[PDB]
Design a protein around this ligand. Structure first.
Ligand code: A1IXG
Ligand code: A1IXG
Ligand code: BDF
Ligand code: BDF
Ligand code: CL
Ligand code: CL
Length: 90
């Protein structure tokens, strides 16, 4: 089987974030113009999607991590990954 990725970007540098679901776990790689480095995101999941938006120059990232029929939303708003309110009845 294959790892599964999701990607987002912002600005004109740009910043890029790539999330990889590998063998039950999601991790994050980061580009800020000067080489790829490892991000702070680490959460369980077999499937991942992502979206992001800016308020001014402040990025807001939402990562949707799924295992079985449960999807958990993880939020980056400048100061730590927090659990979002997203729910669904799958
Ligand atoms: C994310 C994901 C996991 C965690 C899976 C599987 C798949 C999977 O989806 P994805 O990778 O998108 O799609 C596949 C792709 C692209 C290929 C080429 C596959 C398989 C899948 C399906 C089938 C498959 C699966 C296996 C194992 C051990 C093998 C050998 C295995 O045959 P393989 O010769 O790789 O063929 O179980 P595994 O615990 O990895 O479960 C089942
Ligand atoms: C428990 C279980 C069930 C009930 C599955 C599948 C898997 C599965 O997990 P597991 O067997 O541990 O991991 C896999 C391994 C080790 C290999 C080598 C696999 C697959 C899986 C994934 C992918 C796969 C699946 C298929 C079918 C018909 C094929 C041909 C098929 O490609 P196959 O050449 O076997 O590759 O559907 P199936 O109804 O069997 O659903 C999907
Ligand atoms: O500069 C890297 C970082 O802080 O960027 C914002 C988010 O992508 C974080 O997970 C990541 O560690
Ligand atoms: O500030 C976090 C939050 O309110 O952001 C907007 C949505 O992503 C919500 O699910 C999430 O709880
Ligand atoms: Cl690099
Ligand atoms: Cl964090």
């Amino acid at each position: 089987s294959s790892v599964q990725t999701a990607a987002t970007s912002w600005g004109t540098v740009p910043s890029i974030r790539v999330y990889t679901a590998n063998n039950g776990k999601i991790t994050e790689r980061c580009w800020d113009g000067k080489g790829w480095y490892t991000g702070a995101f680490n959460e369980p999941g077999d499937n991942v999607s992502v979206t992001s938006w800016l308020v001014g120059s402040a990025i807001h990232i939402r990562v949707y991590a799924s295992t079985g029929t449960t999807t958990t939303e993880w939020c980056w708003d400048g100061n730590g990954w927090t659990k979002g309110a997203y729910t669904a009845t799958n």
